[PDB]
Amino acid sequence: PEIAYPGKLICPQYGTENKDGEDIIFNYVPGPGTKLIQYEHNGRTLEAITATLVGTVRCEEEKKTDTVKNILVSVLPGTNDFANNLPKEGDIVLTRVTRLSLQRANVEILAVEDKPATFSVSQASSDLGETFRGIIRSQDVRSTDRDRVKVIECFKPGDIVRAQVLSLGDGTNYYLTTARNDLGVVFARAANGAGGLMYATDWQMMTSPVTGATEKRKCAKP
Amino acid sequence: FIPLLKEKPNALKPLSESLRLVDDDENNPSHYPHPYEYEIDHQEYSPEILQIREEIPSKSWDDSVPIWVDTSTELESMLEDLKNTKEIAVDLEHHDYRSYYGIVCLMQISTRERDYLVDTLKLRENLHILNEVFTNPSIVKVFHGAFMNIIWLQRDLGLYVVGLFDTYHASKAIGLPRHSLAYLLENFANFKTSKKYQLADWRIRPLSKPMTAYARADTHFLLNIYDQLRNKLIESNKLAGVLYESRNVAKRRFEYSKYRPLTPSSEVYSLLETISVPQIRDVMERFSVLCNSNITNSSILLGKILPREEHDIAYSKDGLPNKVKTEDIRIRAQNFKSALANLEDIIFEI
Amino acid sequence: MSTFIFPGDSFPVDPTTPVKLGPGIYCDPNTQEIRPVNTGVLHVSAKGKSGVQTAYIDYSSKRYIPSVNDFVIGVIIGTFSDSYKVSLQNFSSSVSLSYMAFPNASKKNRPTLQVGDLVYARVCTAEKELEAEIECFDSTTGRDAGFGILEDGMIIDVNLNFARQLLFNNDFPLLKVLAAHTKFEVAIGLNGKIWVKCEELSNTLACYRTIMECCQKNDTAAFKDIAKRQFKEILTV
Amino acid sequence: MSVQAEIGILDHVDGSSEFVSQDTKVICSVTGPIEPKARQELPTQLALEIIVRPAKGVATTREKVLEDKLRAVLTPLITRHCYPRQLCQITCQILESGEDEAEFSLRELSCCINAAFLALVDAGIALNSMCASIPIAIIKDTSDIIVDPTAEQLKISLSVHTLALEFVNGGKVVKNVLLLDSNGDFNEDQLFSLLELGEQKCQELVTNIRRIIQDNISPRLVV
């Protein structure tokens, strides 16, 4: 698989070989960048893995602890883009708080996280509402005492909040959560950007070196 | 902890009674008493701390050099000099990265006229003679943020303070917006504080002129803060409160961690069978059939200028355009990436 | 005659003195300097006030900005789960009035108010970057509340200065001049709203016309005499 | 520099003014802080809605430039962080050009800046400092720098200039140059001679404005 382009055939749905007097069955699974497409040829139909992206073809297989070998066929970019890595349920994202009212905290997705880090950045404009907007409900702010949560003491306008996707929600708002130790306000300035840089000293407290003023926030565990 | 000083000037209670082994109570265990606890409670404050008076500005930074004190002789001269004051300003620098408990690396002392910088490393075993002045109750000792520094003087140098005025308590009692010591320097001395020098160990010598300069400025700033505290507190009916707090700061005696009192106080610090291999084999065949069967650019108009590679230019002193190297852009980027990653890690907040 | 100030002018008080900053005065988050941002008369409280001097600027304005511990007159305009949507002033951001806070409050118990009702309410919380909250009963009130519906009457628009003087200044003759003619009740809001009711409409109307005329002239002397012509004209029929 | 202004002339607006220089008369109104439209909302700062209406005809792209330059002056003047997620409507209705609008927009812009500032003062909106704007022009035969030129002087000008400075400390310290809009042929020496004389007449204008503001607002306040 030297090269990948949209529409190029990769492999059949199944494969096999002969090793040590035993036939090994390869079960190929359509991964990210590929798709099972049914073609016709010689009169008989055929389903084959087809690349849907432009890049280098990669495969992975795995058995975990919690004859047929399952192989995952995928296509990665060859050469940054927030296209192929659109925010899905379970993904962690970096978003900026746009507005606060008592009911909920609202942020617009700026970037997305990946497993061992690296980041994906949305090229959309925050000036034209081109960015995917999301909502952090008051009961999804933290894990303990979700009934009595003051939004004003958890987030502030302009704060950069690292959150995880709960659901796609509607077309307007994603639904996010920060009820983990590594989630919450990550980057912030005092007085909504009118002050100096604040770092997360305590998990619930933010401190600034020149300002001499401390503002409470639901910060990620340092 | 066994106090390190066998000589007790300005004593009201002989050093004897001071060296008394206390019993083990339910609240705390056995341990030596603060030697100057008595005098700190009994000795009268200089009656000049008590009157509102016109303020004496700090000497102009440039009329003098800080006095470096690292010989026994210089120290003795300094001592004779402090004996002549009615008030002095004191500070320390403490290092704890390459030492278990910590070591006192510098002492700063200012009179109205001069600033002293004391090598407390070289003079560790000599500094006790300052007890003449440091426990002389008629000479004010002005500290800012000295609650730890009181402990460390004890621990390392065997030095005690009777006649303490802490400008931090002064600032609090007055209700100033920022306690911070620099704040005073920033607003009264028109001096901008620098963070970086403190974080790196101060052990290295010779000390940097910039590194000397902050200490020289700092003592003066502290003196100014003390002066501000003295008159406003008197005016505000709050001076008595600050001297009480200051005696509580002075009063505490450092103790070993094991021996620390039970109640921590501010007085002491311490399935798949179905599909055949043969059937799958046929799949490999038909795929090979399908796969096998499947098996210059010039620009007419806008081809030349539209996909133009990004170039940068830098005009020199002569005004001639110079093409930035295509290579140059990459080199800065690598360097920039390096600088942030190494750069990011260290930050200390006080 | 007063000591007028303009934005970008030097602040008289010295940093050595602890000062509580009120309206008009701004503390820059970046440079930490205290500077005036409004135009008007600077008022500095005398020393000895518990060691804290309060400095502010009295400036002319008619657009209300919610501040904690303010008595305001709002109009119900909306229904939201867990509270009323109430508007202090036209085109301004709405304020919230919880169902929880009422004179004989119960979580089970609910308010009978219907959109369009006037409420005498206190603004307990006013976060700058969050919707204003208005409560009929206050903890500060400590079991005494004047808060609730205003029935009938007539409401009057008035600049914030005129309303502030009517609520806090006892030397303001307006209430007195209106008492020497007829007897009626009045609710005063710091959001520039004045509620007036009498037994007869002609008297309420007469009060309405006087308050507007007096608010327009702002000549303290005029109202007692100005009021006299107003009362007379109603009986003209 | 014999300008004339009135403050608080409109009833259904938070603040208003009427600035007149020569034949150039502009009336301005300011409402805010108020509830903003969703597309206008700024999470941390105040949103400015700035509108300029011409003396003749409807608003074109010309006035769109007047709105843009007026924005560059008013934006740093207002302490916007005091009003997060909020709106301030600023409308300027030019009543009389005082110049050939087919050729110049100099006097109308300066008068709009002065009027907008006065309207902001009247409305009681947080301002970081004060401001004054004057129109300046240069004549080729004369070689002169004329501050506050007439329409007839503009017709025979080689360059036209709009200068708006930011004043603090009782109108004595030039904090910054908010706007300098120089158009036409001019050299570096002319520019600084313009800036030197321009700063003087601007400082005189602030002093006059401070007088007007106090004369109108003080009767409203109490002693």
UniProtKB/Swiss-Prot annotation, chain A:
Pfam family for this entry, one: CSL4_N
GO MF terms, alphabetically ordered: RNA binding
GO cellular component: cytoplasm; cytoplasmic exosome (RNase complex); exosome (RNase complex); nuclear exosome (RNase complex); nucleolus; nucleus
Compartments, record wording: Cytoplasm; Nucleus, Nucleolus
Domain of life: Eukaryota
Primary localisation category: cytoplasm
InterPro entries linked to this entry: Csl4, CSL4_N, EXOSC1_C, NA-bd_OB-fold
GO biological process assignments: exonucleolytic trimming to generate mature 3'-end of 5.8S rRNA from tricistronic rRNA transcript (SSU-rRNA, 5.8S rRNA, LSU-rRNA); mRNA processing; nuclear polyadenylation-dependent rRNA catabolic process; nuclear-transcribed mRNA catabolic process; nuclear-transcribed mRNA catabolic process, non-stop decay; RNA catabolic process; RNA processing; TRAMP-dependent tRNA surveillance pathway
Keywords: Cytoplasm, Exosome, Nucleus, Phosphoprotein, RNA-binding, rRNA processing
Coiled-coil region: none
Subunit-structure text: Component of the RNA exosome complex. Specifically part of the catalytically inactive RNA exosome core complex (Exo-9) which may associate with the catalytic subunits RRP6 and DIS3 in cytoplasmic- and nuclear-specific RNA exosome complex forms. Exo-9 is formed by a hexameric base ring of RNase PH domain-containing subunits and a cap ring consisting of CSL4, RRP4 and RRP40.
Family affiliation: Belongs to the CSL4 family.
Further comment found in the protein's record: Present with 5550 molecules/cell in log phase SD medium.
Name listed for the protein in its UniProt record: Exosome complex component CSL4
Organism expressing this protein natively: Saccharomyces cerevisiae (strain ATCC 204508 / S288c)
Curated annotation (Swiss-Prot), chain B:
Protein residues bound to UMP: 93-94, 152, 195, 198
Phenotypic effect of disruption: Deletion mutant is temperature-sensitive. Impaired growth at 37 degrees Celsius. Impaired growth at all temperatures, nonviable at 37 degrees Celsius. Mutant is defective in the 3' processing of the 5.8S rRNA and accumulates a discrete species, 5.8S + 30, that is 3' extended by 30 nucleotides. Accumulates 7S RNA. Accumulates 5' external transcribed spacer (ETS) RNA. Accumulates extended forms of snR40 small nucleolar RNA (snoRNA). Accumulates U24 + 3 snoRNA. Accumulates poly(A)+ snoRNAs.
Superkingdom: Eukaryota
Residues the entry annotates as binding Mn(2+) 2: 93, 218
Residues that bind AMP: 93-94, 152, 195, 198
Localization (cell): Nucleus, Nucleolus; Nucleus
Residue intervals of the 3'-5' exonuclease domain: 67-233
Positions of Mn(2+) 1 binding: 91, 149
Disulfide bridge map: none
Binding site for Zn(2+): 91, 93, 218
Note: Present with 2160 molecules/cell in log phase SD medium.
Subunit structure: Component of the RNA exosome complex. Specifically part of the catalytically inactive RNA exosome core complex (Exo-9) which may associate with the catalytic subunits RRP6 and DIS3 in cytoplasmic- and nuclear-specific RNA exosome complex forms. Exo-9 is formed by a hexameric base ring of RNase PH domain-containing subunits and a cap ring consisting of CSL4, RRP4 and RRP40. RRP6 specifically is part of the nuclear form of the RNA exosome complex; the association appears to be mediated by Exo-9 and not by DIS3. Interacts with LRP1. Interacts with NPL3, NOP53 and PAP1.
UniProtKB/Swiss-Prot annotation, chain C:
Keyword tags: Cytoplasm, Exosome, Nucleus, RNA-binding, rRNA processing
Summary of the function given for this chain in its UniProt record: Non-catalytic component of the RNA exosome complex which has 3'->5' exoribonuclease activity and participates in a multitude of cellular RNA processing and degradation events. In the nucleus, the RNA exosome complex is involved in proper maturation of stable RNA species such as rRNA, snRNA and snoRNA, in the elimination of RNA processing by-products and non-coding 'pervasive' transcripts, such as antisense RNA species and cryptic unstable transcripts (CUTs), and of mRNAs with processing defects, thereby limiting or excluding their export to the cytoplasm.
PANTHER family the record matches: EXOSOME COMPLEX COMPONENT RRP40, PNAS-3 RELATED
Record protein name field: Exosome complex component RRP40
GO cellular component terms attached to this protein's record: cytoplasmic exosome (RNase complex); exosome (RNase complex); nuclear exosome (RNase complex); nucleolus; nucleus
GO terms of molecular function: manganese ion binding; RNA binding
Organism field: Saccharomyces cerevisiae (strain ATCC 204508 / S288c)
Occurrences of domain S1 motif (ranges): 67-137
Note: Present with 6050 molecules/cell in log phase SD medium.
From Swiss-Prot, chain D:
A GO MF label: RNA binding
Record's subcellular location: Cytoplasm; Nucleus, Nucleolus
Any Gene Ontology biological process: nuclear mRNA surveillance
Alphabetized InterPro entries for the sequence: ExoRNase_PH_dom1, ExoRNase_PH_dom2, ExoRNase_PH_dom2_sf, PNPase/RNase_PH_dom_sf, Ribosomal_Su5_D2-typ_SF, RNase_PH
Subunit-structure text: Component of the RNA exosome complex. Specifically part of the catalytically inactive RNA exosome core complex (Exo-9) which may associate with the catalytic subunits RRP6 and DIS3 in cytoplasmic- and nuclear-specific RNA exosome complex forms. Exo-9 is formed by a hexameric base ring of RNase PH domain-containing subunits and a cap ring consisting of CSL4, RRP4 and RRP40.
Family per record: Belongs to the RNase PH family.
Name used for this protein in its record: Exosome complex component RRP46
Natural source organism: Saccharomyces cerevisiae (strain ATCC 204508 / S288c) (Baker's yeast)
Gene: RRP46
